[PDB]
Every structure is written in structure tokens, then in C-alpha cells.
Amino acid sequence: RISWLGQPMKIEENRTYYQKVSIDEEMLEVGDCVSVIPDDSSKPLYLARVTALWEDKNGQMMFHAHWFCAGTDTVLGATSDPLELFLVGECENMQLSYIHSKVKVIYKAPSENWAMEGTYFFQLWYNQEYARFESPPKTQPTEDNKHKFCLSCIRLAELRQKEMPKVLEQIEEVDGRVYCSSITKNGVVYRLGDSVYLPPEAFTFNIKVASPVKRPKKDPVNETLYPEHYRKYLDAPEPYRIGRIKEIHCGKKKGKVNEADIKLRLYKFYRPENTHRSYNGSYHTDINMLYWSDEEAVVNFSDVQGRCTVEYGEDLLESIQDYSQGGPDRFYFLEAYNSKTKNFEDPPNHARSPIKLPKLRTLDVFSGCGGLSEGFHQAGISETLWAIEMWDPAAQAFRLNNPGTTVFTEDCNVLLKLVMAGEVTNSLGQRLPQKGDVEMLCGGPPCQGFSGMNRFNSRTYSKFKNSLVVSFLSYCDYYRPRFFLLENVRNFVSYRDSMVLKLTLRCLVRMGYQCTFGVLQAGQYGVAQTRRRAIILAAAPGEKLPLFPEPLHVFAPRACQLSVVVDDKKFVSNITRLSSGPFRTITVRDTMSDLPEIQNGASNSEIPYNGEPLSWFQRQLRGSHYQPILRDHICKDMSPLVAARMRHIPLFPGSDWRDLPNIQVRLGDGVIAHKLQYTFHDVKNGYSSTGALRGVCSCAEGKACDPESRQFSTLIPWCLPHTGNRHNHWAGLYGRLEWDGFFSTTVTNPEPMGKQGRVLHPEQHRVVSVRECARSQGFPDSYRFFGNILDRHRQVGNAVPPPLAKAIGLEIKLCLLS
Numbered sequence: 001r002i003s004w005l006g007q008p009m010k011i012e013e014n015r016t017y018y019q020k021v022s023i024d025e026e027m028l029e030v031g032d033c034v035s036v037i038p039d040d041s042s043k044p045l046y047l048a049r050v051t052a053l054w055e056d057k058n059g060q061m062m063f064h065a066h067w068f069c070a071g072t073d074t075v076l077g078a079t080s081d082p083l084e085l086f087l088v089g090e091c092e093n094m095q096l097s098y099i100h101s102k103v104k105v106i107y108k109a110p111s112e113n114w115a116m117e118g119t120y121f122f123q124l125w126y127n128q129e130y131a132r133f134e135s136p137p138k139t140q141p142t143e144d145n146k147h148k149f150c151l152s153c154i155r156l157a158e159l160r161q162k163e164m165p166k167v168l169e170q171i172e173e174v175d176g177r178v179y180c181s182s183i184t185k186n187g188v189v190y191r192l193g194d195s196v197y198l199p200p201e202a203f204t205f206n207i208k209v210a211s212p213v214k215r216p217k218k219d220p221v222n223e224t225l226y227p228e229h230y231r232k233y234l235d236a237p238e239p240y241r242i243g244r245i246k247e248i249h250c251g252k253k254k255g256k257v258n259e260a261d262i263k264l265r266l267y268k269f270y271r272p273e274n275t276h277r278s279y280n281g282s283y284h285t286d287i288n289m290l291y292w293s294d295e296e297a298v299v300n301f302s303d304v305q306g307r308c309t310v311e312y313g314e315d316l317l318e319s320i321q322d323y324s325q326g327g328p329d330r331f332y333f334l335e336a337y338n339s340k341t342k343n344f345e346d347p348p349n350h351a352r353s354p355i356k357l358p359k360l361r362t363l364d365v366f367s368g369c370g371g372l373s374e375g376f377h378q379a380g381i382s383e384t385l386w387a388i389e390m391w392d393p394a395a396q397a398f399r400l401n402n403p404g405t406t407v408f409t410e411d412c413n414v415l416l417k418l419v420m421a422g423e424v425t426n427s428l429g430q431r432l433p434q435k436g437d438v439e440m441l442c443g444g445p446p447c448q449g450f451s452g453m454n455r456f457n458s459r460t461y462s463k464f465k466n467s468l469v470v471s472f473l474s475y476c477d478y479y480r481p482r483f484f485l486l487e488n489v490r491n492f493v494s495y496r497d498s499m500v501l502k503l504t505l506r507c508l509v510r511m512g513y514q515c516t517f518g519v520l521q522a523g524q525y526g527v528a529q530t531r532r533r534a535i536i537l538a539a540a541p542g543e544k545l546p547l548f549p550e551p552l553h554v555f556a557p558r559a560c561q562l563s564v565v566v567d568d569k570k571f572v573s574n575i576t577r578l579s580s581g582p583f584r585t586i587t588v589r590d591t592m593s594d595l596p597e598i599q600n601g602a603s604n605s606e607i608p609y610n611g612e613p614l615s616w617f618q619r620q621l622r623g624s625h626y627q628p629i630l631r632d633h634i635c636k637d638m639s640p641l642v643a644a645r646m647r648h649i650p651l652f653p654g655s656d657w658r659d660l661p662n663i664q665v666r667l668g669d670g671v672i673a674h675k676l677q678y679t680f681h682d683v684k685n686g687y688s689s690t691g692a693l694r695g696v697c698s699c700a701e702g703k704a705c706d707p708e709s710r711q712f713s714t715l716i717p718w719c720l721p722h723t724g725n726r727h728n729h730w731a732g733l734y735g736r737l738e739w740d741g742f743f744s745t746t747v748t749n750p751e752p753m754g755k756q757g758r759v760l761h762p763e764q765h766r767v768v769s770v771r772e773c774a775r776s777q778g779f780p781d782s783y784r785f786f787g788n789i790l791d792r793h794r795q796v797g798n799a800v801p802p803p804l805a806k807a808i809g810l811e812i813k814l815c816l817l818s
């Protein structure tokens, strides 16, 4: 029994809208919230806010339903509050007769005294694709639409407008094609003369590139000399193509422009490695130097990945260095390249041209030596005034690099209790930060004792409440910083069925924080290392929630699975550059080709560079102004035996322990290592080509371990064949880095037979040095470390690479504007 109330608000041709409707003699109004019963008795009750009421010519009495999302249908899942709802951009038109009931939905707004703190309700807008919880839109109804106003609809509408290709300015039609001077897509304006990013396969270069002369693959292998050789049964994409726009033309459909058919005709730009110089010719060139060319390419607008600035070197008002560091996607050229005569020349003339941010006061918990704080400092967004680092060498390291920061070498739990208690100072006179002092809180809480995937139970759930991850959040709750950053190892998101991640997102939401999570790969921000980190970003109610930085460098695909599965739902970050990118990858070579030769065990912490920077990367890390000191080019002093094994790993890419010869070697002691003996069969690995046995223990046949079989002082480590079968023949152990490759995750203590053992230098017979490890992270050469060599390695391997941290910093920098 459904009848309207009051006089109609507005009339259309097919619809008349109303402000009030009567359903079973009960007032319902635009703005009220409502429930609808699912056909599936097992799904949670449907809940919507009524955004509009209207009547059809055909007698249908309608309302527009803007749905809420229940907590358990977001990342939080079963951890979220039963009565909490979240806004989402999902709505549709439904007939009033489907409504089951009125509901009360309260907007729990953040209090005006929010910073000092610490019927369904809602507080945040949930983005289900990126797992972002964000402040609700501020958008208000205008008189014109006050009758149909739907937050969901406007968001979908605004999106459609941003996403779609639209031509802003037409010139003239020529031979069934309209030529344009300006177009737009996804919020970016592209004009004639602008440059564009394109997939590697958008177009081709006219230079001929001969497939290498190839090579035999060794000769036969003597298996008595190499009894373990038998166990040995560039993948990063190309960076973007770049082109200057020459013409822009699209077809016509039904006498109007067909915007799904916009085409751009471009001048190809050459990267140095695209000319014949290839890689051997560009080791030393700037990552953003290009070469002009008069080659033209036709491309679909749909393929344009973004806009970039490309300038002729001489027309610049600033210095090449200054221009380059001035903004993102800035390239330059100084010569043209004739693809036909392979020569470089001057550029044609038509190729030529025509509020200081306050720094956030920052507290860095579990600071380490300051890799994370260094990255923020570089972005210009923060000032770490307080750092907490319980382990003394690292704490001292932090002081060396941040003279201005109060470093508390102490347990974070007792420190927070001290401030909560109103104490102004710890026992050492150090002034504790107080409520209001801290604007940005960041840190990497060691999430120990949650690895692996067994369930969580009564006993495990509590230690989480008593873990350092909870301590970090307790900090967030007390200080209520404007921005919150939690860094960790990738598996933070998957620890204990993703329950650690879910409890930490639940916690940030309970406090009223906007928040999200994602995985990033340090390699993609200008470092030659695989290092995936989980990152939790949070922003106070009044702020913008940051985005994750777009990858800058192409990197090995296997190391860039940044996506996370939580209860079978796949979450991704806002990152859009899912394959290629602006800059070529940074190699082990870019990283440390300028460093003087040192020997196993070298201990002189100050030696001169005996020769200038060679890589773009080395120019960045050594600086533009003076320093003569190469600090920490020191390496661990290995056993005579371990040193000998190292002299014997061949220098070919992929070499490791299985390449070792079964020979007697004179050690540095002056001792001789005897030969490893094979006196057991391997039913799984068989006999060798020299008719030799391949087992070094009785368990290989397979029985049980033999009391005496074990062998000592042998070039081929006795144990590696012992258990080779169980561990893919221990590939990588005593393995050399490749000049063309990248570091495995940079470790706290580099050991050839350790967890991560690809730690031998590519040419010298030694493990990598403290400096090289600092370079594998993104540490400047001026960055200081402290303690013995093992202390310094630990500090370096633990840090967040400043280039990753900086990347995160610039995204926060965007949130201080807009």
C-alpha cells in the first residue's frame, strides 16, 4: 500500500521525483537508510541510503539505492565490527516495493579534538579494488540535483570523464581524417610538440641489430675433475618508447569525431642503448639522455602510457643536473642520430624549442641506521627529530647521519609508558616527544615469531597483542600523527592467514585513520636489488591518503608480483605501470664498477677512489661536490679454505659451488686440502660419465647416515653433495654476482654457504664489501656507518633503501598540496 507524500519536487518527461513517500503508512524520505532481503538466505542483509524517489509514467514507484558495504565484505573480513558499514561506489535503481525496513546509519565523524584522544554506523569510504579506506567525500548537493544526489553515481561519472579519450581541439579535416592540436585522456593533456610514453612494441627502430654471433657452449666436461658439474641442469622488460608528437588525427563516425580512433604520428627518440652503441656504449650515459631522430611512427592514442618532458640541452635555463632533479619524467638530448649512416650530429632546428613546504616533525621507530629516514629527508617532506633504536651501533650510526635528532637507545615499550605517564624526560635527560610534537610516525617493527602459515589459536593471538607491531600502533594511537608508515618484509601481509595484516588495518580504522596497504619492489625505484616490502600507509581524517609510487625502473618480472591475496580476494595497489617504465634497470655494474680492488679480509675503512664515477648511478651516489674518501670498502676475512673456494669459482654468469674442481689446493695457511672422495651410490643421481660414484654418505643409497663418512678440509664442501638432492643441488651457494644482474636481498651477514649466498664479487675472490652492500641499497657514499664490519653489514642489510623511501616520500609530498 504505497502512496506519495507532499507535492512533487521536480518533473522530467518520464519521471516525477518526490521528497517523501509513504510505505505502509510509514514516512520514508530521501536521505533515509533502508534494508533489502537477499534471495540467498546466507548473505548479509542489503543496506542502502535512499538518494532519490520518483514515479515512472508506467506506474512504477522507484527509489535510487546507494549501497553500504558491510565490514566483513572488505579486507577486514571477520575482524571488523559487526555494526560498522563503509561507503562504496555501488548503487542502482530499485522499486520501493522491495524495501524490507528502515535502518539508522550514524556518521561517526572525527571529533574536533581527535588528535588528543587515545544502529549501524560508518566512517570511511571503502575502495574494494585497492583496499583503501578513505575520508568520505565532502561533495554537497546543489539545488539543481538536491532531488537525485548520489555520491556513488557522481564518483562513477567523474571516473568515466577522466578515463575517456576526448579531443579538446580540432584543426582541419584532410582526406577523411580530422587533425587536432590537443587531446586528453585520464586527466593528462597532450598537445602538439609534447612527448609520450609507449610500450616497447608500439614501434620499431630502423637501425639493424644483428642477433649475436652466438658461441659454442663450452667443450666436454671432465667429470672426475668436476664431479658436481652435473647438477646444473636479461629478463627485465624494455623501458618505454618515447616520441615527440608531430600530428594528431582521428577518423569520423556518423559525421562526428570518432574518439575511439585517435592516432598520433611521432618522431622516434633513441635511447643510447637503442643505437648501435647498445649496452657496451651506454654504461656511462645519463638514464634520461636521449638522441633525436627524424624517424616517424604512427601509434594508437590508446597505447600512450603517459606524458613526459623532452628538451634540447642548449635551450635550457637551468643546468642539466638541476633540470633533471627538478621534476619527474624529464629527459634531454644533445645530438641527433642518423639511423642510416649510424652517425651522430647536431639536431635539426624544428627539434629545438619555439610556499616552502613545512617539514613534518617525524618520529622514526625501529630506525636502524636511518635508511628510511634518509629517503624521507631526500624528498624534503620530513625532519626526523626523534629516533628509537634499541641496538646501539645502529643508534650511533643514526646520530652520525642526523646530528639534529634525539636518538633514544632504549626499549620502546618503557619509553611510551614514560610519556603516557606525563614524564618529560627519560633517565638520561633526553626530552621525550609529546602529544602534538609528532606529525609523522614511521617505522619497521620486527615482526618476528609469526612466520609460516599455521592458524592462529588462543595462544598465538595474544602474543600479537604483546608484539612490537602492537607497540608501533600504540604509538600511532597516542600521538595521532598526520601520516603513518609501517614498513616490513613482504610476508607481513600473509603472516598467519593474513591475520596480522587484518588486525593492523582493523586497528587503524578503529582510531579513525584513513589507510591502505601494498607491496613495492625496491628494484623499481633505482636500486640493483630484489627487495619486496609490505607498506601500510595511514592518514589522519583531515588529510589525503597517499598513493603508492609508480615504478621508475624496469625490473625482472619474477621479482615484481606486488599483488596480495587475502581470503582468496586479490588486492592490488594504485600502481598502474604493471610492465614497462621510464628508466632502464640499474645493474650490479652500475652499482659498483668504480670501486678500487680489495682483497679478502681488507680492513682499511678509508681509501681514495682511484678513479672517477663511471655510471649514472655512481655519479648520484658520490655527488657533484667534493669528497676524496671511499668509506667502508672493507670485506670479511674468510678461512684459508673459504678463500680458496672463492679463487676457484669461475667468472662466467651462473657459476657457483657445482663448478668447483675436485683437486688438492694449497691454502693460505700453507696446508693442502685433500680431495673429496665418493664412496657411496646415489640411486637417484646414478653413476657419472667417468664411471665414478656420486654419493658421499650411506644415506644416498638410501640407508641412514654413516658414522665416519663425513669429510673435512675439502675444496668441494663435503656437506653440499650430502644433502644436494633435498635442496635443488644448492644452486647459488658460493655463487658470483653478475655484472649484468642484481643483488639478491641484501643480507645482514654475507656468507657463501648462508641462506642467501650469491655474495661473491663478479671478478674478485671475496665477498661483497660494506660499501658495495650500501650501494646495493641506495645509500650515498657520504652516509656513515659504525662498529665492526659485522655491525656495519647488519646496519646496511636492515635499512629501507633510501630510493624506495624517497619514492614513498614524494607521494606523501603530494598530500601536503591538492
Ligand SMILES: [Zn+2]
Binding pocket: 051, 064, 065, 066, 090, 091, 092, 150, 151, 152, 153, 154
Ligand atoms: Zn547512484
Ligand SMILES: [Zn+2]
Binding pocket: 697, 698, 699, 700, 704, 705, 706, 722
Ligand atoms: Zn648421509
